[model samples]
Target: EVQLVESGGGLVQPGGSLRLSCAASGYTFTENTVHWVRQAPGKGLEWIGGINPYYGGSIFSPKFKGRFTISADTSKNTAYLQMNSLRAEDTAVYYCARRAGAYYFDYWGQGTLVTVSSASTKGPSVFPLAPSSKSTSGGTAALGCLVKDYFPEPVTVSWNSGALTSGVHTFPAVLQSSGLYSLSSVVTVPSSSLGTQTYICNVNHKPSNTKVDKKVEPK
Candidate 1:
């Protein structure tokens, strides 16, 4: 599976510089060109530019000509989009895609969101789902929670009010085009004891000193 994994997104103050990257895998990097595209919050996509991995040749959209640079490192199978003097208008999800033919973008990264804001912190919005049991001798129950639209990134999740520790899986946070983040977590436990057990998803955002808990009571 050809994949482009992007990284390096965060809050940047106005006039600050930022560099976002795309690491490609499952294909020869130098054989194709890499292009960058971005979308402001609630807006349509805008082309930034592209670069030839092998020759280092580049192309840019007139609007980004002076402030953005696209480059690639063939040896690392990685491409980068460098931006300078960022502003609030620059807040968006930036994507790197593999260019095919002249105008087609074949494979694309999930995107990295960079938010240019003066304020430093934002709290997360969390929601938890009811538990479900899968048929089995030692039937197991599943718990899930959603944590999204947070800033300064790091968030923690716990199950059963921090009582249950094992069988927990927290997926990586995804950057949204809204210049925010979203994450999901799940935990599995033996359902045999559900009649007297409690299932809860606790999400904490340390920077904001925010803690949220969602409880699911089984019938």
Candidate 2:
């Protein structure tokens, strides 16, 4: 099986550079050229570049033509992309693909979604923190849900777990010196009563008008 794993930051600052590495495994890299491509949500795909080990040549999209670079390390079966001077619009899901034959077919890594945003009251980074379990009074059990590292105040978060949940703790969003905000609010749920009931957390960052959700399950 041919596999490509991408490693990069989940978030990047505006005007900063990002290096995305796609480490290949289980197959010969020199036999095929690898390409870098990205797609923003709801948008068509856009090319970045590709590198062929045999010819030591590269082909880049005109948009990424002069500024970006794509390189390969056949010895390590890896492909590299140096994406420089990025903007918020540059954030998208990127992939590394192997072209084994003359035409595109049958090779793509799992997508990596990267976010590029400004610190000025911008988007929220929403993901479930590792949930915790504890014993409370009676037949009730507690599950903690925390949302962290967001910007701009008025971040409202909610949890849904039928009648299994009592209320949420909206921990104050602490102001970071970067003019951003960081928060960790938790919701407690009755463990056994949850049964097949689904749990979800919806996060909203004000001013920026950003909304994101994280589905929670037994960790």
Candidate 3:
């Protein structure tokens, strides 16, 4: 009987990362594509993505696109998920199943429930500032966004400086004692940017589904 084994499962704090593996020891693992599926505590199954070991091809769901990666080891016949930038909502059961075709699962492995927890669910406090001119040009400016004391990660901060301008800078969040997370970001305004435009900051706590926006307008 062709058998599949799942291993390397684990728990990761929000804003952290981890990996899960599904190994095929029975059949020729490369015979078909190995897929990674996920199910939350109460939600239906979701297709995180899949990998064809023989061809080194991969695909992922839009929601999981930037948040995670699907990879495989043809020699070991193993399919794995490299989950990055963990979020509280990502805590769920993950499984590797055989797909005969049409996204159907004919065989399955024991599901590994990954928990993104152990820290606080309290969201981060963010302070957004208006765009201030850095140079005399009044065109080159910086908008400050500070995120502090956020519990589990996957806390995302976004900026809208009127248009899609370049030179925006963001530093990775800092993890501190009590397992809280913080980060800083600054958006650079173009030389042609107008002072009459407004700057907006959007923050989301993925676990709690809490969203907050801060805006600054020029009078």
Please report the candidate that would top TM-score against the real structure: 1
- lDDT score of residue 162 within candidate 2: 32
Candidate 3 wrongly placed segments (more than 4 Å)? 101-103, 120-219
- Candidate 1 positional error at 175, Å: 16
Per-prediction CA RMSD (Å) = 7.4, 9.5, 13.4
Task: Point out where model 2 deviates above 4 Å.
Answer: 120-219
Q: How many Å off is the CA of 65 in candidate 3?
A: 1.0
Residue by residue across 1-219, what tens digits does model 2's lDDT show? 778888763666778888888888877677778888899867988888899866668998788887788877777777888888899788898998888766684678887767677655457677665445522233544444455556544466777623334666767777777667777756665655455656677776655667776776665
The lDDT of each candidate is: 0.84, 0.71, 0.75
Q: Pick out the ten consecutive residues of candidate 2 with the lowest summed lDDT.
A: 134-143
lDDT for 124 in candidate 2 is 69
Taking the tens digit of each residue's C-alpha lDDT, what string does model 3 give over 101-209?
6768888888876768765476778887656653346457677678788765456677773354466666877788767778887777753454555567777766556
For the record, the alpha-carbon RMSD of candidate 2 to the native fold, in angstroms, is 9.5
Q: Write the per-residue lDDT of candidate 1 for residues 1-219, one digit (tens) a residue.
A: 999999887778899999989999999998889999998867999999999998998999999999988888888899989999998899898999998876799999998778787767788998775568643437778868889898766677888777888888999889888877799998887877666666788888865788988776653
| TM-score of model 2 (CA atoms) | 0.58
